[PDB]
Amino acid sequence: KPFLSAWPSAVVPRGGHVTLRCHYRHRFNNFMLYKEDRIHIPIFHGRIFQESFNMSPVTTAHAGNYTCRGSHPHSPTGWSAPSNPVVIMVTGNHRKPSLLAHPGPLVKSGERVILQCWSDIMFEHFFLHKEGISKDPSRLVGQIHDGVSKANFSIGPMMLALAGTYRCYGSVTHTPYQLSAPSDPLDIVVTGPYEKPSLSAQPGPKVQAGESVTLSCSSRSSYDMYHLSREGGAHERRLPAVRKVNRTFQADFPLGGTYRCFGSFRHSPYEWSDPSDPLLV
Amino acid sequence: GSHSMRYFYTAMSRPGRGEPRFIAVGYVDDTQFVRFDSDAASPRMAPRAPWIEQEGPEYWDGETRNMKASAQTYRENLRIALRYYNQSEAGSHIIQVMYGCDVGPDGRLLRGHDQSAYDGKDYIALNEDLSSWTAADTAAQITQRKWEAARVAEQLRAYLEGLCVEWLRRYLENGKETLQRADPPKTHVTHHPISDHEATLRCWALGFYPAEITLTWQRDGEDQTQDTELVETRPAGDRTFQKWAAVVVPSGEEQRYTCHVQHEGLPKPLTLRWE
């Protein structure tokens, strides 16, 4: 049977583009497409696609559950068995829901987190999707409660493949392949097992306006970047690490509150070190 | 002694052709004994030699969980490698890993190994001290920094000194009458004309185990190491091996040519000649 795939993503915004490819007998040409309810009835009145099928711009009519069959002239039937199924989900068709993490977005390696999706729109289903993934979004039935519908996605035990940027979507009862606009995104970062850095203040954590204070994140480990997070919920500052004469790797953040820092590496933005001990300024 | 255990992992992406695949195989010396293939409908670590078959269910369950986790890890590593090398998500790539331990006649660790490759070239390797890494390029140097920060080498060293050795010892006992009993080669020489001025002498070794063997041609006692065609050692399919060595000789000089066979299954080295 052929291998059917969607490129670059099966989850695609209205107005975007997606190409279905049907790989069979080491080629990508001469195939037919089918949708889940009509299983032996080819779409577009049995169109024989001469190459990959590009849908662009994407409309809600493209959303659906697809299989392909490839041409096979020298065989009993004219054609191959049905491919694996690919579900094209088209986003941008309802008001966006909301996504929050419990207890928070920084998740220790091996532990679990809940990503809750909710909306005052009654969505029959919710979908949770990590950016850039081929994995099918996770789906849960929505639960109605006090004028909202919501679902709890359990994520973990936490490892790198689970870390990244997440969005959630809703769908309404009779158009299950039509998704809402995406929720605002949430970065879920795995922490550990890389050794924690050290945090310090210069000249010290005692400061009175208006004099300058710089916090330094330092490690003997060769971190490429440091992240400074302050309890209380504005997004971390990031700075490149610099190697010092004594062979440590350090970044200086010129700025009260309670801070921690984390190291990370090149091309690896969603896995951070264990957190430093806290520092109150 | 001496013996080795090795695991070999292949993780491959194939965008548009199939889902990423992870295959692992385990060997004691030249004998494969387990396999795991992510393509299977319900992937499990599975026996590939009779002497491991009577191992209990906790073994198979534990190894299956470990392979499932490793498969996930290496699928992700394929994605990471794309970032390190600035490669497109359209191309097909392969990560390969081999690791394991060598032990002496007394069953004690002689050497530990852990080497990885990306697209068929060295990527990163554990050094002989089992406490430091050699990275082949700048991409691998990122991995090296992560592994140092996470103390990976200490954990791998603990595996290689501990479980790797203890389990190799157990398998060697479980399979003693096959794994620890060398099978000598059955040997013969064949003669194949080229013209009525030249001919080929081919020295054959069949049905030997382990795979290690030396076939040499001498002409009045001098190695023809410069003029010998040596075919790659090949599996017979029954856990024994085959090899041959050929030399082109002038007609009528066949008698100054001797084939020398060295293998652990042989009491004394063999010296054969065509007749």
Binding site: - | N66, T73, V97, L163, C164
Partner: peptide, 9 residues
């Protein structure tokens, strides 16, 4: 027995 040690790149 296979290695339990994770090798994340």
């Amino acid at each position: 027995l296979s290695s339990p040690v994770t090798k994340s790149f």
